[PDB]
Symmetry: C3
Subunit: 337 residues, 3 copies
């Protein structure tokens, strides 16, 4: 497309919503290609990542860890206004894995505090894709400080299975998984720091062990539990988008399955089916489609169970509906032998 | 199906066999859907896992690590009687990844010592699937104490390749891989404990390092080597089911291949082919089909070779038959 | 094929080149099956792996880490002359993952210093495959001393996509990724040694942590940058072969994609498409095909970004050509 042709396209402004929710969109594209406009303000902010009060100086697209999910369709243009407020201390940029050129946009979006930039790219490939900050020389430090999210580029005709049958979800959640590396004192207690820069050296040391202290969804241990548990109903079709910008994960819905899983996150790559546990490598997003069949509580976890239940990588679903005794029944409840 | 239809299905009791062997079954289903009944007794016991007398307080389905492979067909029901003897000291349950609902059955099977339970579930999806204990608040501790196994839900018409041609194995083995986290004292000597609970705090500290002290097949270093090597013959077709309930592995048959590999373990997902090394994520089972072409000793490993050769994740096959010089020949033997 | 049939086949001697370059070859086979002849001399040598002067006692096929890429076509025979000079101190052998029997050739190629051997195997399966040294009882130590590489067995009709459409590359590069485990003294400084054997015990202690001190391409931090950055032009189709003999990796072309990726490395397994980041398990090779569409610098990384940017796993591409503003444009450059 020429400059004139792109200038002629309709523009659509989108208001982002905080994970694990996803901004309103249509699965099947409405009309021809558009320039879809998003704005994110970067916030360097203290966040608490566990019940003990452990603090991280987070670097947060739109003030959240993960950053929000942007949804467009294949061959739309994504136009991001990225703002680095003067209250911040560090330069920041953005690498969209969905994009082609200039280090995914990183080379064109280096903004100092008090600066903004507008990047446009053509979303040429359908799938879910990581985005993350990547300032030359400080790349992993920004990413493991929470400065990452994902986007979804839906096919113009919506999702299909590996054989051309339409797959239409009733709801979608975005689970951003974050490995944190929090320095400890000689008592083995987590350190707090006055400024983000104060924590750098101590944090790099932990990072180099390749052993996160916390592995969490939505920025904190237990973040997607209790009144923040995800929800569904028997018969409801749910898409769970999952990202990890730095480190491998292996999602599992305890009590369920991934009926269709785009484990590579790419929609032209046929999904795996009937999955127990799927695998998303560090630096990628994946998506699983499931129709709930049983009511009750589910745990959705990274199935390294140490990572899930010791380090924080467990969320819950609460599911309404009628129990199905055909699928499963307690023939004899726990009782004396 | 209607209530009367489910009630009318035949019930069949099956006797289990210890890993790496697999109980009697048919690849193609015999007759219609059945309720296949299994019984497993949970044993808490000290086991030695290496050549240095290192102990683990194992938590073992049916007394083995891994627990035994249960084999059914798609749309059968698996009806398990799970027994926790009064001599045990912990509550146990079971999560079948093959099952749908109540945390895979975990929510319905919490049994204290001196209790039993019977769970039935419909095996709606074909594949190999992990099962493991999962008491709320103590999940990884039970799993890394060896309380995990796998089942296989065969398609009613047996296995096929991606092009729908039948794949019929001559034999099947189940390799369960276990990451252990054994505490050490300040001299680097592995610690021993009187009761399982006594090891809890020290063990969790090791677990949180994400670095196992041992990675083993069939519950111990070298358990599937020497006189306990798996066997085959040139021309024989072998299915190797592999599981890891907590941690990634990357199986490899040294000297061979995975001709067809359901790396995700699910039979409705077409198998990868001609594989050198396949990948099974923690919390899953996979299966590899191979036709042996050469006699001799093979190593079957987790191909992180430190895990295989320093930490214990190496098995052998001993294969009989005629050498094939077309496939491989020493043109010049090692010489000056 | 019979012995006589093989003896009648054409022979072709190949001259190997140092990674990341690949020796001259044809994508589509030229004529029928041949016996393709390669020679490699093993060199035990010191390598410097970072800008702090950190040393490894490398054990290097053809003097490089990784060893060179050998390219044949399916159903060719690969005939390797392997030479262990008297100047070396250790026994070495070779396991080709592409080969069938005798532990991939390891059981037939054990050569002491001052010995050579010649191994022939039939390349029956198309794909990229790891090869590595594997002396019994010292297997991972040789592998993580850099004694590994890969081969490519092309289909005789060259590469195709999942739908049978031809994929023809303009350039090919081979990135061998290496995990190193370098001992440190009490002050956290990397130790140096004056013989490979002197480092064994200390190195094993680090290996057993499963935590590499360095993760590098082509034997050193920054090896494939600057004077050794890989190159292309807009429009050019490039195949990137990537291996890791011991440990998982997750390649990603920063600024680009893997248009087609044989993540398992096997050409009869249809490639994944439009990949952001692919995954290659330890003990395997994979291959990604991409057509460059933008000029400029790309980083090619293991996308554990700590591994890439703290531990060394980052390469660059330098790409010539015209910028495409349709694909990407700065609507407003960084400004107040
Ligand atoms: Cu990235
Ligand atoms: Cu599980
Ligand atoms: Cu190998
Ligand atoms: Cu940043
Ligand atoms: Cu248990
Ligand atoms: Cu060697």
């Amino acid at each position: 497309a020429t400059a004139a042709e792109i200038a002629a396209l309709p523009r659509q402004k989108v208001e982002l919503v905080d994970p694990p929710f996803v901004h309103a969109h249509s699965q099947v594209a409405e009309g021809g290609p558009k320039v879809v406009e998003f704005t994110m303000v970067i916030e360097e902010k203290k966040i608490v990542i566990d019940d003990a009060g452990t603090e991280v100086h987070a670097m947060a697209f739109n003030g959240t860890v993960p950053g929000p999910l942007m949804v467009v369709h294949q061959d739309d243009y994504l136009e991001l206004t990225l703002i680095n407020p003067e209250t911040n201390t560090l330069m920041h940029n953005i690498d969209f894995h969905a994009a082609t050129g200039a280090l995914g946009g990183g080379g064109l979006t280096e903004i100092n505090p008090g600066e903004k930039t507008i990047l446009r790219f053509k979303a040429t490939k359908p799938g879910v894709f990581v985005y993350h900050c990547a300032p030359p020389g400080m790349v992993p430090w920004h990413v493991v400080s929470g400065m990452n999210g994902a986007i979804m580029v839906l096919p113009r005709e919506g999702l299909h299975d590996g054989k051309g049958k339409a797959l239409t979800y009733d709801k979608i959640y975005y689970v951003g998984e974050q490995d944190f590396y929090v320095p400890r004192d000689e008592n083995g207690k987590y350190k707090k720091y006055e400024a983000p820069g104060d924590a750098y050296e101590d944090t790099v040391k932990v990072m180099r062990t390749l052993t996160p202290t916390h592995v969490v969804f939505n920025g904190a241990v237990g973040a997607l539990t209790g009144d923040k548990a995800m929800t569904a109903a028997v018969g409801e079709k749910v898409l769970i988008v999952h990202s990890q910008a730095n480190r491998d994960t292996r999602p599992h819905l305890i009590g369920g399955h991934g009926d269709y899983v785009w484990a590579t996150g790419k929609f032209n790559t046929p999904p795996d089916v009937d999955q127990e546990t799927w695998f998303i490598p560090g630096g990628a997003a994946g998506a699983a489609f499931y129709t709930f069949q049983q009511p009750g509580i589910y745990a959705y976890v990274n199935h390294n169970l140490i990572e899930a239940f010791e380090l924080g990588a467990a969320a819950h679903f609460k599911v309404t509906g009628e129990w199905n005794d055909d699928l499963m029944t307690s023939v004899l409840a726990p009782s004396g032998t």
